[PDB]
Symmetry: C5
């Protein structure tokens, strides 16, 4: 991917629960968009919400106020002792998807739904894993461009 998007406006909305993993993901996304796709730091809006359940709601509210070419919803869900994990994981995933089709703005799913901390960190590039935030960054640019031209 040699796609450059210097006029793209990207929005990043991440939950704040479990930051040991969130930060590396958000960081990876931003760095990849800037260093590999020529996106301008000043054209990247980063916002946060309490948890993953608010990801769709927060993204929906934001794309109504400003104009973005692509959005990235980042969050981490870890299986617990109850059925909570099962039910909101599904609700959020179906939710983001909806906000995207309703608004016409691309929504990248930066949602990790893991069984334990270790799996989440590994996917954030720690302990020899690959940072998925990088992939989401590149995806956002591609969808942003294809959404225009």
């Amino acid at each position: 991917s040699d796609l450059k998007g210097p006029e793209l406006r990207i929005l990043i909305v991440h939950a704040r629960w479990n930051l040991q993993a969130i930060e590396p993901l958000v960081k990876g996304a931003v760095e990849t968009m800037i260093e590999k796709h020529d996106v301008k730091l000043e054209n990247i809006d980063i916002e946060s919400v309490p948890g993953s359940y608010e990801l769709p709601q927060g993204i929906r509210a934001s794309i109504a106020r400003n104009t973005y070419d692509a959005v990235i919803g980042i969050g981490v869900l870890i299986k617990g002792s109850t059925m909570h994990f099962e039910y909101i994981s599904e609700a959020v995933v179906h939710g983001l998807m909806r906000v995207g089709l309703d608004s016409g703005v691309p929504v990248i799913l930066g949602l990790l739904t893991v069984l334990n901390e270790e799996q989440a960190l590994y996917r954030a590039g720690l302990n020899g894993g690959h940072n998925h935030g990088n992939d989401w960054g590149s995806a956002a640019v591609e969808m942003g461009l294809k959404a225009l031209y």
Copy 2:
């Protein structure tokens, strides 16, 4: 650190299983007033028979009055049949919908546990952490960010 003295919050809770509901509603209210400067007279508390009416009750309410954020509280416990499985999913997807359709933030105060003990623990009893507190702060934050 986030103060919201002009916010109007709505809390709708089911009435089924009150040993857990009360602590949750109370924690939510206390946290909003004591930590976020929300005014007691700006908090409306309503109830419905069960969790299945949560979406329907919240929808009806935000159509009559104007709220900045809403909290849906209820407790679901796995039983002998497949009821738990199906309505848990329906309610979670339903509250989520009302939130996106109306544009009003809907905090999910629904506990979907396997037994009574897990419910109480998450209500702050028996050495657990009261989630109603987290929901209170969340409602304030979403209320403010929504403008």
Copy 3:
């Protein structure tokens, strides 16, 4: 202790497995009349072939007449195929929808059980508690709150 003598309630029940449906419909009606002062003339009872037509039947009816609350009653029992799993989800999500789209409360009177015995028990037979009673009371409350 909620009285609703001017309420108009609609009950739509599937006809599949009547050993359990009847007790439920009867419990619902009795409870509304004897404990909430609802008038027999004000309760409309309709039926559909099966649970899959519950949302469709309810939607059609609330388009012709005006009701304050509705109750969808039906019984689903796990069979040998995956049929149970799939239409149970569809119906629960579907009634939920008709309720939010129309603005009319829709009480879920749907039992999703593993066998006949579980269904009857929840119909108040063999020492169980009749859930139709709970649904009747719910219908009233939601009806009034909808004002």
Copy 4:
């Protein structure tokens, strides 16, 4: 135990959309649906439209397109899904059932679920009335009629 009706609907227009995958089971069902509507409910052969699609995934899409062109009083979506080696079964079964349900509520036209979601071929045939089973197409036909009438 399913309780039927002795309802007559000679002015009803019924549409039947079936997938073609696995016809050993589809035919009996379609045939049962049709015969039952004609012989027991007085529906007129000319008032029954029968269309088909490649597979069950196109059932909602096909029905939607058709009820936009013509006017029907009730629709029946017929199809057969059998658990395979992958997760395909699980996912499209759910998608289709939710899908037909939607088309029915959006359009206001009754949609009968003639979808069999079985674990093997045997279970499908049995429910198609073969090998001592009960033909479900029959039940769907009566359902279509009833919903059609109540819809007025």
Copy 5:
């Protein structure tokens, strides 16, 4: 027997796991051309990063141009987390929606397998049958019936 020389087909495929995507896209195209008389110049082929963008991509494309039928191709393989389970469902439900909202047929060219071998087999490799072929014929049929 079904020829559609005036049909305009759209193919949108994810780029993840190309060892399987190519055979499928190839089979789809060949079958439409060699068996249904579709004209190569009337087949638009586009791509997206992953399966999650499939609905989003298709939606954007059928808004710019007019197609008679669409095919969404992608491959999802169970992993170590719950990711597979959740997006598989989301994408299948999403493509379905785009189809019903737009009125344009959307063929499901999404494989949801447990391992690489299963995907390749269904791509016609190792003695399996290429499903891309079936999707191509399907697209043609739906395109025509849609008129």
